[PDB]
Amino acid sequence: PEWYKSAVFYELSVRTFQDGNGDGKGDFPGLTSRLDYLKNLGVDCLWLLPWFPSPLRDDGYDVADYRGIHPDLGTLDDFKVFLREAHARGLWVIGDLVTNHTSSDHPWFQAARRGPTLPDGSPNEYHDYYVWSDEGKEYADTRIIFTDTEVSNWTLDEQAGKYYWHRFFASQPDLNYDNPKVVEELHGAARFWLDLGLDGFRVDAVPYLIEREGTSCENLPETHEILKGFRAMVDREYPGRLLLAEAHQWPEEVVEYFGTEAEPEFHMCFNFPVMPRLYMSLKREDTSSIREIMGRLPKIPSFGQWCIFLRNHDELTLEMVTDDERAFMYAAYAPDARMKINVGIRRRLAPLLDNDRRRIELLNTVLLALPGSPVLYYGDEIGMGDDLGLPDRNGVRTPMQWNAGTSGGFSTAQPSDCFFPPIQDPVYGFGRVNVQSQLQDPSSLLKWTARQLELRRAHPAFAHGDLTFIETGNPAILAFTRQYDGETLLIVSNFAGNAQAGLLDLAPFVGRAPVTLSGASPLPVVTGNGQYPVVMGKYDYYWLRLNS
């Protein structure tokens, strides 16, 4: 009955989604002139990447002003228009709150490098906004996230004469949360956008706020306690608004970012731990990884909801699989050197799947049939490729391809003038892969996606239903139930590339009619001991309901 539970999220980047000024970069008037596409696609809630003033050393995750609107994208007036227009269509909009760090260009860190005591004598209140060390020897058992760039997590600052902490890029100094004033600053940054009517934030790099000696400085308890404070605020001051976390960690630690009915934290976390096992299972044709990891997720509080996703603006991340699993995921999905960046693969959905529609359709149904609310990477619903010529994780962020005209419909600037080049190779280029062509293709991947979402939308068990795996006895075939209110769903997906047989244990269901959700065609009723034989085509999926 929470709104975000039955929602369907869509992730996009105002700078890559739609130009409006012909400038080569997208803007909020560009995004605003396309809200009819998102609603009519079947999106409920837009998640927009960071839109704040930034030098874009990390595409806006180095925020320079938490209450502004990056010029490229237009004005705070523009932003308040877009919020009115999406709200009129019944779309929620959530932003990206970058709590762990700011840009080195931020007024705060510009002030901070002035040292602790000021020229006139007085305290320098911004010095302890950030995290300083004299020689940089604290925190030594901590992994470095941005592997192909950073070599320490401490950087020397010329003016300050001291060292400063950054879990990410050197130009992204970490904020010091033992500073009470810093917590009050973010609360103030949140309140500003939540007073303009934003429906919540997806919160970034949450596990890295506090760092302590003798720990990996991930998932610390005092970090969790900061986060409950946000939840505490937003619950009191904005009943309704949504906190959604990106906690890339192992299933045992991720669930804690929900934390407790009495001490609530996030409303939604991403189900990072299933998403690599999905790709893994396609190559091993062995879905067992999916169950093992799903079984390491303990129950989440009543308010809690999983955000299911396949790709996103970051790389496909192998930071939380075993050493062998990572070796395997590079071997199978990263044959080239260029394809890998810091423990991960910078490739979009369709290249990863050899542009196989069956496989794209397979993983999308699993994404819609796994428990939670699903998020869609922009462009992936028409089958966009990538540009591995672009540096660091940007090749998956090429601009939305809207038609076959200039620069894909994204701009009227020539492709070489756009912020990222719009893709125009023979396979995934906008002349072949574009939204106009797919609004008129009765069988386009666009129309299949939207049909799929109508199909999920008609069956509340997909959002709120429980989940129960059933044994099948063929590891290529994955099957499970979703029961909720009236109906019980039965979802059986073939993860292998040719016809597979399988013996489903439907013991608890003897005597039910299993029927197709698309048009109610009947299969045999379950009888005897409830071992239900099935054959599946290559990469098939059956979405079924069990009548009784």
* Interface with its own copies (CB under 8 A): 354-357, 403-404, 425-427, 431-432, 436-437, 440-444, 496-501, 516, 518-519, 521-524, 533-538, 540-542, 544
Q: Which does 23 bind (CB under 5 to 8 A by kind): its own copies, Mg ion, Ca ion, none?
A: Mg ion
Run of H or E including 268: strand 268-270
What is the DSSP annotation of 276-337?
Answer: HHHHHHHHHT-THHHHHHHTT-----TT-EEEEES--SS-EE-TTS-HHHHHHHHHHH--SS
211-238 in b/e burial notation, b at 16+ Cβ within 10 A?
beeeeebbbbeebbebbbebbebbbeeb
**CB 485, min distance to its own copies, A:** 24
For the CB of residue 14, give the shortest distance to its own copies in the complex, in Å: 26
CB 17, min distance to its own copies, A: 21
Nearest to 501 by CA among 535, 540, 537: 535
| 100/493 with CB nearer Ca ion | 100
Residues 145-174 that bind Ca ion (CB under 5 A): 174
Q: Report, in Å, the least distance between residue 17 CB and Mg ion.
A: 10
Distance CA 512, CA 259 (A): 38
- Residue 139: name its binding partner from its own copies, Mg ion, Ca ion, none (Cβ under 5 to 8 Å by kind): none
What are residue 340's DSSP bridge partners? Answer: 345
**Which residues from 1-60 bind Mg ion, rule CB under 5 A?**
19, 21, 23, 25, 27
Task: Select 21 or 355, whichever has its Cβ closest to Mg ion.
Answer: 21
Is 73 or 453 the residue whose CB approaches Mg ion more closely? 73
DSSP code, position 249: S
3-class DSSP state of 391: coil
> Would you say 503 is a known binding-site residue?
no
β-strand partners of 503 = 533
| 100 binds, options Ca ion, Mg ion, its own copies, none, Cβ within 5 to 8 A by partner type | Ca ion
392 labeled binding residue: no
Q: What angle do CA 501, 505, 508 make, to 5 degrees?
A: 150
Residue 160 binding result from Ca ion, Mg ion, its own copies, none, given CB thresholds of 5 to 8 Å by partner type: none
| Residue whose CB is less far from its own copies, 166 or 456 | 456
Q: Is 547 annotated as a binding residue?
A: no
Instruction: Give min distance, CB of 208 to Ca ion, in A.
Output: 5
Separation CA 504–CA 482 (nearest Å): 15
Catalytic residue among 59, 246, 315, 386: 246
Angle (CA) 87-91-97 rounded to 5° is 90
Asked whether residue 21 is marked as a ligand-binding residue, the answer is yes
Q: At which residue do the structure tokens 């991947």 appear?
A: 445
Quick one: which H or E segment has residue 31? helix 28-32
Residue closer to Ca ion, measured from CB, 112 or 316: 112
CA end-to-end span of the chain: 26
C-beta closer to its own copies: residue 223 or 474: 474
Q: What's the token pair of residue 469?
A: 């795996």
Q: Is 219 annotated as a binding residue?
A: no
CB of 131 to Ca ion, least distance (A): 7
The partner in contact with residue 442, picked from its own copies, Mg ion, Ca ion, none with C-beta cut-offs of 5 to 8 angstroms by kind, is its own copies
Cα–Cα separations (whole angstroms), residue 42 to 1, 87, 305, 449 = 19, 15, 19, 9
For its own copies, the closer of residues 293 and 368 by Cβ is 368
Alpha-carbon span 337 to 322, nearest angstrom: 21
Query: 58: annotated binding-site residue?
Result: no
Question: Can you give the length of the chain in residues?
Answer: 548
Is 204 one of the annotated active-site residues of the chain?
A: yes
Q: Please, what is the Cα angle at 197 between 195 and 199, to 5 degrees?
A: 115
Q: Per the residue annotation, which of 11, 72, 204, 315 is the catalytic one?
A: 204
Tell me, yes or no, if 246 is annotated catalytic. Answer: yes
40 is in an annotated binding site: no
Q: Is 100 in the site for Ca ion (CB under 5 A)?
A: yes
Q: Which helix (H) or strand (E) holds 252?
A: helix 251-254
CB of 418 to Mg ion, least distance (A): 10
* Residues of this chain that bind Ca ion (CB under 5 A): 100, 174, 208-209
Binding site for Mg ion (CB under 5 A): 19, 21, 23, 25, 27
Residues making up the binding site for Ca(2+): 100, 174, 208-209, 211
- Show which residues are catalytic: 204, 246
Return binding residues: 19, 21, 23, 25, 27, 100, 174, 208-209, 211
